[PDB]
Design a protein around this ligand. Sequence first.
Ligand SMILES: *C(=O)/C=C/c1ccc(O)cc1
Length: 125
Amino acid sequence: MEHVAFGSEDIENTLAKMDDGQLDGLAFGAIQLDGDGNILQYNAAQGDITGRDPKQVIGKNFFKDVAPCTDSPEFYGKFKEGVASGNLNTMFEYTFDYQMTPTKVKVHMKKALSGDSYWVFVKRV
Ligand SMILES: *C(=O)/C=C/c1ccc(O)cc1
């Protein structure tokens, strides 16, 4: 298992160094998005939470297609504010309930180290 803790101050530095295989060793869910919300990476721990097969969601749009419950000012609105301002770093609780048993999570969104892609980190609560 990779040793990186959810919510770490320098998490984006650690994950910039990791390939796909290593992302799958994280203890929490990790999704990498572009600025339009298209899914670039989606790890195994996230699929364990949500029942989605990573291979099938990569390339889809997270807010339009995969996770409509996150199309809300509270989630998608904060994402788009952070993409526009260049300072995305926020943590909040949320419920995921589209085609799945409703599941409470903690979400951390953070800009990636290079600044042109964005992470969504998820763990159960
Ligand atoms: C709400 O529709 C949430 C859906 C969801 C969240 C996260 C995922 O990785 C997949 C689906």
